[PDB]
Structures are given as structure tokens and as C-alpha cells.
């Protein structure tokens, strides 16, 4: 089928925080828990790069990775936590399996949402106390924010 091939280099090594403002830190190499920054740079830092096919719908996919290791975000199913799939380097030609790493980036001010471009019913949530889960909407705070560090 048509492959979704890398569009443009977005932002990287930023501190990712939700509307709850919990900078999402990796607690384990498979599970991630969000916690409010005060140094700003305290969470594991992501790097986003958008990738492109004209087979979306009306929404575009970006790549979520932590700058440090190449653990990329897999999209599970609704209220079931986002899984850390280690797929090396941001793909330039994306065919079937890399589809776990699609994110619909809706930016509003500082906060922004990530709807799974494959399935909305997957949505990239941020929790104030619990692990970073998923839902087919939010009642989880699926806000994120690109937060630069204090000094």
C-alpha cells in the first residue's frame, strides 16, 4: 500500500508535560509515569518528527521518541497504557507495522493533544498519578506541552 514517508524534522529534547503538567518520565523501559516538573528538564525528553502520506484522514502523524534510547510509542487500544516499542530511528518510509508510532498533534497554546491517527479510540493520555495510558477520548489528560528547561 502507500507508505507514510518522513515529512519534516520537528522539535526535540523538549520536556513533555500534560495539562495536568506532569512531565512524563520513563519509570521502566516498558512503562512510563508522569510527574510535575519544577526544574522543567526532569522528564524524559521526546523528539517529534512528522511523517507523511496522503492516506491519513484529516489528521497528520508525528513521531514520539525519547531522545535518550530509541523507545518509540506503540499505540495499544483505548484504556490500556502506551507501550514502549523500541524501533530504531525515525522511519522515512512507513509501512504497516510502524503504525504504532502515529500521533495526531493538535496544538493549542502550550498544551496539545495526540490522537492516534490510525484509531482515535487510541489517544495519548497523561496521568497525574498513574502510568501514561490511552483512551478513545480523554478522561485521561491527553495534554502535552513542549516545555523548555529552566537553566
Curated annotation (Swiss-Prot):
Alphabetic keyword roster: Acetylation, Cytokine, Cytoplasm, Glycoprotein, Inflammatory response, Lipoprotein, Mitogen, Myristate, Nucleus, Phosphoprotein, Pyrogen, Secreted
The primary site where this protein sits is: nucleus
Post-translationally, this protein is described as follows, namely:
Acetylated within its nuclear localization sequence, which impacts subcellular localization. Proteolytic processed by CAPN1 in a calcium-dependent manner. Cleavage from 31 kDa precursor to 18 kDa biologically active molecules.
Provide any one GO MF term from the record: interleukin-1 receptor binding
| Cellular component aspect of the GO annotation | cytosol; extracellular region; extracellular space; nucleus
GO BP terms, alphabetized: apoptotic process; cellular response to heat; cellular response to lipopolysaccharide; connective tissue replacement involved in inflammatory response wound healing; cytokine-mediated signaling pathway; ectopic germ cell programmed cell death; extrinsic apoptotic signaling pathway in absence of ligand; fever generation
Residues glycosylated per entry: 21
Keyword Secreted set for record: yes
Q: Where is this protein found?
A: Nucleus; Cytoplasm; Secreted
Q: What does this protein do?
A: Cytokine constitutively present intracellularly in nearly all resting non-hematopoietic cells that plays an important role in inflammation and bridges the innate and adaptive immune systems. After binding to its receptor IL1R1 together with its accessory protein IL1RAP, forms the high affinity interleukin-1 receptor complex. Signaling involves the recruitment of adapter molecules such as MYD88, IRAK1 or IRAK4. In turn, mediates the activation of NF-kappa-B and the three MAPK pathways p38, p42/p44 and JNK pathways.
How does this protein assemble?
Answer: Monomer. Interacts with TMED10; the interaction mediates the translocation from the cytoplasm into the ERGIC (endoplasmic reticulum-Golgi intermediate compartment) and thereby secretion. Interacts with IL1R1. Interacts with S100A13; this interaction is the first step in the export of IL1A, followed by direct translocation of this complex across the plasma membrane.
Record text about domains? The similarity among the IL-1 precursors suggests that the amino ends of these proteins serve some as yet undefined function.
Give the family this protein belongs to, as stated in its UniProt record: Belongs to the IL-1 family.
Record-given protein name: Interleukin-1 alpha
Which species is this UniProt entry from?
Answer: Homo sapiens (Human)
Q: What is the lineage of its organism?
A: Eukaryota, Metazoa, Chordata, Craniata, Vertebrata
Amino acid at each position: 500500500n502507500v507508505k507514510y514517508n518522513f515529512m519534516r524534522i520537528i522539535k526535540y529534547e523538549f520536556i513533555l508535560n500534560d495539562a495536568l503538567n506532569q512531565s512524563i518520565i520513563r519509570a521502566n523501559d516498558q512503562y512510563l509515569t508522569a510527574a510535575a516538573l519544577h526544574n522543567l528538564d526532569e522528564a524524559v525528553k521526546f523528539d517529534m518528527g512528522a511523517y507523511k502520506s496522503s492516506k491519513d484522514d484529516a489528521k497528520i502523524t508525528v513521531i514520539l521518541r525519547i531522545s535518550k534510547t530509541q523507545l518509540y510509542v506503540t499505540a495499544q487500544d483505548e484504556d490500556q497504557p502506551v507501550l514502549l516499542k523500541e524501533m530504531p530511528e525515525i522511519p522515512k518510509t512507513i509501512t504497516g507495522s510502524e503504525t504504532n508510532l502515529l500521533f495526531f498533534w493538535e496544538t493549542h497554546g502550550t498544551k496539545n493533544y495526540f490522537t492516534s491517527v490510525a484509531h482515535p479510540n487510541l489517544f495519548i493520555a497523561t496521568k497525574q498519578d498513574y502510568w501514561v495510558c490511552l483512551a478513545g477520548g480523554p478522561p485521561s489528560i491527553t495534554d502535552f506541552q513542549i516545555l523548555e528547561n529552566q537553566a
